[PDB]
Every structure is written in structure tokens, then in C-alpha cells.
Amino acid sequence: ASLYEKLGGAAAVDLAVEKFYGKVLADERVNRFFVNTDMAKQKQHQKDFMTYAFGGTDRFPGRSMRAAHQDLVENAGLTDVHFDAIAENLVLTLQELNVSQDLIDEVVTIVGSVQHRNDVLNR
Numbered sequence: 756a757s758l759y760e761k762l763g764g765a766a767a768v769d770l771a772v773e774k775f776y777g778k779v780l781a782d783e784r785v786n787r788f789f790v791n792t793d794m795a796k797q798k799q800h801q802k803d804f805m806t807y808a809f810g811g812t813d814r815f816p817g818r819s820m821r822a823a824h825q826d827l828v829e830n831a832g833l834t835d836v837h838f839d840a841i842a843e844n845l846v847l848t849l850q851e852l853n854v855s856q857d858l859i860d861e862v863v864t865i866v867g868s869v870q871h872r873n874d875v876l877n878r
């Protein structure tokens with residue numbers, strides 16, 4: 756079925772997003788971007804987005820990646836080194852949880868891609 760399902764569905768995704776943001780909040784390279792962010796709500800939005808991205812829901816939720824991040828590009832100096840850190844954090848999350856490499860590579864095809872980078876970084 757969906758990648759979402761093979762990952763273990765709503766509760767696994769929830770877990771991974773929690774673990775993911777633990778790392779992000781503990782990562783000096785990027786954590787300043789969330790210093791004013793309501794994190795329960797961010798985790799919810801991130802769980803929404805991934806639930807869709809992994810084929811678990813039938814319509815794009817919330818803001819486009821480009822629009823969600825345009826302010827950080829314009830004001831907060833967001834760029835490659837920040838993108839790389841976020842994607843590396845996500846992969847570390849799934850590796851530590853020992854998700855199979857097949858499934859992680861698939862995830863990375865979505866969240867590591869140049870497509871996503873260029874949306875986020877507004878290029």
C-alpha cells in the first residue's frame with residue numbers, strides 16, 4: 756500500500772515527527788528558526804504534510820512549501836546549509852528508529868529532493 760502505511764501509519768509518523776523535532780530543536784545550525792514557533796502546531800502541520808506526501812491522504816494540506824518558507828528566505832537568511840541540516844535530521848530520525856533502508860530512500864526521494872529544496876528555498 757501507501758508508503759505512509761508501510762511506515763506504520765498515523766502513530767509511526769507522529770512518533771517520527773516528534774523525534775525529528777527533538778533533533779531539530781537540539782541542532783544549533785537550524786534551531787534559531789523555531790525560536791518563536793508554536794511547536795505543537797508545527798508538529799501537527801508537519802504530520803499533516805507528511806501524511807499526504809507519503810500517500811496517506813487525498814489532497815495537499817496547508818501552505819505550499821514555497822509559501823510556508825518565503826519569509827525565512829527573505830528575512831531569516833534561509834539557504835542550502837539550513838535545508839541540508841533539516842533533511843539530514845529527518846534521515847537520522849528514521850535510521851535511529853531503524854526503519855528499513857528501502858523506506859528511508861523513498862522518504863528521501865520526497866524530502867531530500869532538489870524539487871523540495873527549490874520550493875523551500877524559493878528558487
Ligand code: HEB
Pocket residue numbers: 785788789792800801804816817818820823824827833837838839841842866867871872875
Ligand atoms: C523539506 C524538508 C521541508 C518540509 C517538508 C517542511 C515542512 C513544513 C510545513 C508542513 C510547515 C507548515 C506549513 C503550513 O503552515 O501549512 C513548515 C513551516 C516552517 N518551516 Fe519547514 N519544511 C521543510 C524545510 C525547512 C527548513 C530547511 C527550515 C529551516 C529551519 C524550516 C523551518 C520552518 C519554520 C520556522 C516554519 C514556520 C513558519 C511559520 O509560519 O510559523 N523548514 N515547514
Ligand SMILES: [C-]#N
Pocket residue numbers: 801
Ligand atoms: C519545517 N519544519
